[PDB]
Scaffold this active site. Sequence first.
Site, PDB file in Angstrom:
ATOM      1  N   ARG A 155      21.925  18.844  31.778  1.00  0.00           N
ATOM      2  CA  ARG A 155      20.719  19.524  32.270  1.00  0.00           C
ATOM      3  C   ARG A 155      21.081  20.723  33.148  1.00  0.00           C
ATOM      4  O   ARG A 155      20.431  21.768  33.086  1.00  0.00           O
ATOM      5  CB  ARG A 155      19.824  18.562  33.058  1.00  0.00           C
ATOM      6  CG  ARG A 155      18.701  19.245  33.837  1.00  0.00           C
ATOM      7  CD  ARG A 155      17.709  19.957  32.932  1.00  0.00           C
ATOM      8  NE  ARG A 155      16.777  20.813  33.669  1.00  0.00           N
ATOM      9  CZ  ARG A 155      16.075  21.812  33.124  1.00  0.00           C
ATOM     10  NH1 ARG A 155      16.189  22.097  31.828  1.00  0.00           N
ATOM     11  NH2 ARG A 155      15.251  22.532  33.872  1.00  0.00           N
TER      12      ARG A 155
ATOM     13  N   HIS B 123       8.784  11.638  37.514  1.00  0.00           N
ATOM     14  CA  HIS B 123       8.757  11.781  36.051  1.00  0.00           C
ATOM     15  C   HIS B 123       9.907  12.685  35.621  1.00  0.00           C
ATOM     16  O   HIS B 123      10.335  13.544  36.396  1.00  0.00           O
ATOM     17  CB  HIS B 123       7.405  12.363  35.627  1.00  0.00           C
ATOM     18  CG  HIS B 123       7.186  12.456  34.149  1.00  0.00           C
ATOM     19  ND1 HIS B 123       7.495  13.586  33.420  1.00  0.00           N
ATOM     20  CD2 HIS B 123       6.618  11.589  33.276  1.00  0.00           C
ATOM     21  CE1 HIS B 123       7.155  13.399  32.157  1.00  0.00           C
ATOM     22  NE2 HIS B 123       6.624  12.194  32.042  1.00  0.00           N
TER      23      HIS B 123
ATOM     24  N   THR C  68      11.120  11.314  28.234  1.00  0.00           N
ATOM     25  CA  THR C  68      11.891  10.659  29.283  1.00  0.00           C
ATOM     26  C   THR C  68      13.267  10.257  28.735  1.00  0.00           C
ATOM     27  O   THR C  68      14.299  10.428  29.393  1.00  0.00           O
ATOM     28  CB  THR C  68      11.148   9.433  29.833  1.00  0.00           C
ATOM     29  OG1 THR C  68       9.862   9.850  30.329  1.00  0.00           O
ATOM     30  CG2 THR C  68      11.958   8.790  30.957  1.00  0.00           C
TER      31      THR C  68
ATOM     32  N   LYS D  51      -6.613   9.397  10.156  1.00  0.00           N
ATOM     33  CA  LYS D  51      -6.572   9.393   8.694  1.00  0.00           C
ATOM     34  C   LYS D  51      -7.915   8.968   8.098  1.00  0.00           C
ATOM     35  O   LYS D  51      -8.243   7.780   8.060  1.00  0.00           O
ATOM     36  CB  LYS D  51      -5.460   8.468   8.194  1.00  0.00           C
TER      37      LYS D  51
ATOM     38  N   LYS E  63      -1.173  14.170  29.113  1.00  0.00           N
ATOM     39  CA  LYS E  63      -1.329  13.501  27.817  1.00  0.00           C
ATOM     40  C   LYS E  63      -2.628  12.676  27.792  1.00  0.00           C
ATOM     41  O   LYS E  63      -2.915  11.920  28.726  1.00  0.00           O
ATOM     42  CB  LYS E  63      -0.109  12.609  27.513  1.00  0.00           C
ATOM     43  CG  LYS E  63       1.209  13.386  27.298  1.00  0.00           C
ATOM     44  CD  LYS E  63       2.411  12.476  26.990  1.00  0.00           C
ATOM     45  CE  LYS E  63       3.340  12.309  28.201  1.00  0.00           C
ATOM     46  NZ  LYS E  63       4.075  13.569  28.659  1.00  0.00           N
TER      47      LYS E  63
HETATM   48  N1  LIG Z   1       5.594  21.037  25.493  1.00  0.00           N
HETATM   49  C1  LIG Z   1       4.948  19.955  24.900  1.00  0.00           C
HETATM   50  N2  LIG Z   1       4.002  20.156  23.988  1.00  0.00           N
HETATM   51  C2  LIG Z   1       3.384  19.142  23.393  1.00  0.00           C
HETATM   52  N3  LIG Z   1       3.652  17.879  23.677  1.00  0.00           N
HETATM   53  C3  LIG Z   1       4.576  17.576  24.592  1.00  0.00           C
HETATM   54  C4  LIG Z   1       5.272  18.618  25.240  1.00  0.00           C
HETATM   55  N4  LIG Z   1       6.158  18.024  26.084  1.00  0.00           N
HETATM   56  C5  LIG Z   1       6.057  16.727  26.007  1.00  0.00           C
HETATM   57  N5  LIG Z   1       5.087  16.397  25.099  1.00  0.00           N
HETATM   58  C6  LIG Z   1       4.654  15.045  24.728  1.00  0.00           C
HETATM   59  O1  LIG Z   1       5.137  14.118  25.724  1.00  0.00           O
HETATM   60  C7  LIG Z   1       5.852  13.029  25.088  1.00  0.00           C
HETATM   61  C8  LIG Z   1       6.908  12.446  26.062  1.00  0.00           C
HETATM   62  O2  LIG Z   1       6.251  12.243  27.303  1.00  0.00           O
HETATM   63  S1  LIG Z   1       7.260  11.664  28.296  1.00  0.00           S
HETATM   64  O3  LIG Z   1       8.069  10.740  27.601  1.00  0.00           O
HETATM   65  O4  LIG Z   1       6.444  11.350  29.436  1.00  0.00           O
HETATM   66  N6  LIG Z   1       8.333  12.777  28.808  1.00  0.00           N
HETATM   67  C9  LIG Z   1       7.995  14.060  29.019  1.00  0.00           C
HETATM   68  O5  LIG Z   1       6.877  14.470  28.867  1.00  0.00           O
HETATM   69  C10 LIG Z   1       9.054  14.946  29.492  1.00  0.00           C
HETATM   70  C11 LIG Z   1      10.250  14.373  29.871  1.00  0.00           C
HETATM   71  S2  LIG Z   1      11.187  15.752  30.364  1.00  0.00           S
HETATM   72  C12 LIG Z   1       9.909  16.920  30.044  1.00  0.00           C
HETATM   73  C13 LIG Z   1      10.037  18.327  30.239  1.00  0.00           C
HETATM   74  N7  LIG Z   1      11.016  18.974  30.815  1.00  0.00           N
HETATM   75  C14 LIG Z   1      10.952  20.301  30.895  1.00  0.00           C
HETATM   76  C15 LIG Z   1      11.899  21.173  31.487  1.00  0.00           C
HETATM   77  C16 LIG Z   1      11.601  22.499  31.578  1.00  0.00           C
HETATM   78  C17 LIG Z   1      10.430  23.031  31.027  1.00  0.00           C
HETATM   79  O6  LIG Z   1      10.095  24.341  31.185  1.00  0.00           O
HETATM   80  C18 LIG Z   1       9.573  22.226  30.296  1.00  0.00           C
HETATM   81  C19 LIG Z   1       9.801  20.890  30.305  1.00  0.00           C
HETATM   82  S3  LIG Z   1       8.861  19.530  29.694  1.00  0.00           S
HETATM   83  N8  LIG Z   1       8.886  16.250  29.574  1.00  0.00           N
HETATM   84  C20 LIG Z   1       6.437  13.689  23.818  1.00  0.00           C
HETATM   85  O7  LIG Z   1       6.721  12.698  22.829  1.00  0.00           O
HETATM   86  C21 LIG Z   1       5.266  14.599  23.380  1.00  0.00           C
HETATM   87  O8  LIG Z   1       4.286  13.829  22.675  1.00  0.00           O
END
Ligand SMILES: Nc1ncnc2c1ncn2[C@@H]1O[C@H](COS(=O)(=O)NC(=O)c2csc(-c3nc4ccc(O)cc4s3)n2)[C@@H](O)[C@H]1O
EC number: 1.13.12.7
Length: 532
Positions: A215, A242, A340, A440, A518
Amino acid sequence: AKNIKKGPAPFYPLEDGTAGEQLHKAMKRYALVPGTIAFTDAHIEVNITYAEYFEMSVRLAEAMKRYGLNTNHRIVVCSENSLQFFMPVLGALFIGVAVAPANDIYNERELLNSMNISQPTVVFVSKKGLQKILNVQKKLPIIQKIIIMDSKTDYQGFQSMYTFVTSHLPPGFNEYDFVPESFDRDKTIALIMNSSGSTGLPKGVALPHRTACVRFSHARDPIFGNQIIPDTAILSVVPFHHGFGMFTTLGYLICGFRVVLMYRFEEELFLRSLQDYKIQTALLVPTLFSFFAKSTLIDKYDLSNLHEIASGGAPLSKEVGEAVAKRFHLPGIRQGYGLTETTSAILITPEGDDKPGAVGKVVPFFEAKVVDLDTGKTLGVNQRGELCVRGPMIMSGYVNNPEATNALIDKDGWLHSGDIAYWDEDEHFFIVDRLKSLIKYKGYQVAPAELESILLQHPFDAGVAGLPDDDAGELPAAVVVLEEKEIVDYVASQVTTAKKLRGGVVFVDEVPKGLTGKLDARKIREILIKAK
Ligand SMILES: Nc1ncnc2c1ncn2[C@@H]1O[C@H](COS(=O)(=O)NC(=O)c2csc(-c3nc4ccc(O)cc4s3)n2)[C@@H](O)[C@H]1O
């Protein structure tokens, strides 16, 4: 192989040492530059410098070490965003103790589940979360010690981090002679994060130090992250417990940035803060874009210094994104997509390689592909399937749950995201939705986002889900926050027959959604199922 999208070589190289060693080294450098600010609480207008942050974290580290905590132990950190949040985090990483953040708005069942998984020996908790911890610790005899994070004195019979440190540190302790522990960064767990939990209770996501170290490459990468430049300030409104907030913030510290925080969002505090702190980057979640879309206060303030707004963690409609970017006089909205279980974002909008609607491109060290749901075959360009990713930020596994681990990650290291996605001729990725969210109707796929964006066109909020049938399987339906047949007939005039709102409408005052934005598909379904 042309159907495997690959990250390019990194613009900032991977660094040697544990994540703790890398954070220690950087923050010690910043500590020696007088006046460098690490965190700012915008609500109380209080700053803490790198020198102070560094010194307290090292003291906490040494104290925890002397207390007997080592790589066989876990601590919990349970707190809203605050100036204190990262002190036990950094302390623990300096000495190889695994850190398990616990969502501070978890109910007791959720909280107990999380700590039952991480099995912490020591619990760091804010004043606000203390009672929840007490309410469940009877069931968690592993816990031997509770420490209060945001008090200077003892608080309700518990030591604070400050009195804890004072009762284990020699008075003549020199923070600048402290040396962080060295250990195997592949084997030693840095974080135990909680998963979303579509299949029910969250799991414990174990992340070796190595994934944080990767990272830190992405974070310092001028193209996939933020180039280190002095006097850079970020305004972050993402939960620290998170993955989104954890690994962006650790990156910002590695970069020596000033992280401006807020324990809760308020429109005006946010906007003034952008101005007065000369913020270069705002880190948001999509749900907050509502307030900024209607403009209002925006053009009053001097946002001369704002270079980018970055979103992640949930879908952002192309329309809203473009709208909000225009108001802030930005070329677009920077995106990151991750889970995550992937530690941090593994699809990121590269600087200067933007495409409206896309979540970005595969980051360095990673690969991505999209597969057929039925046979697992790798698909080609523009073909929607399940997004799979692999790279050295993938979790080592779910804690004490090898079955779920193997269900997620196959033998070649591909993580199966449960998201439907596609990539285009230039290797931009688009997220369609979570597979379980897709509707669906009589065999035809209906994506809630298209119906939502269509409902948002009518002169406030809405969520689309599948009302079960018996012949059709599901009928497209929506809960709607107002600003039925009037809506239904309006929709039917904007879309094709297969994706008409046959499910009906159910009026609510709030669409159910999570912290990062979400939508709660399950809750929305229950609401429609009861009503209609
Ligand atoms: N950008 C996105 N667009 C659409 N959907 C998105 C998304 N990010 C996560 N999701 C959704 O969250 C789900 C996972 O949710 S979660 O498990 O809680 N984990 C997360 O949402 C998660 C873990 S790390 C993280 C990020 N880190 C970053 C670092 C820098 C930056 O500029 C942008 C980001 S987003 N997000 C995914 O499967 C997807 O469905």
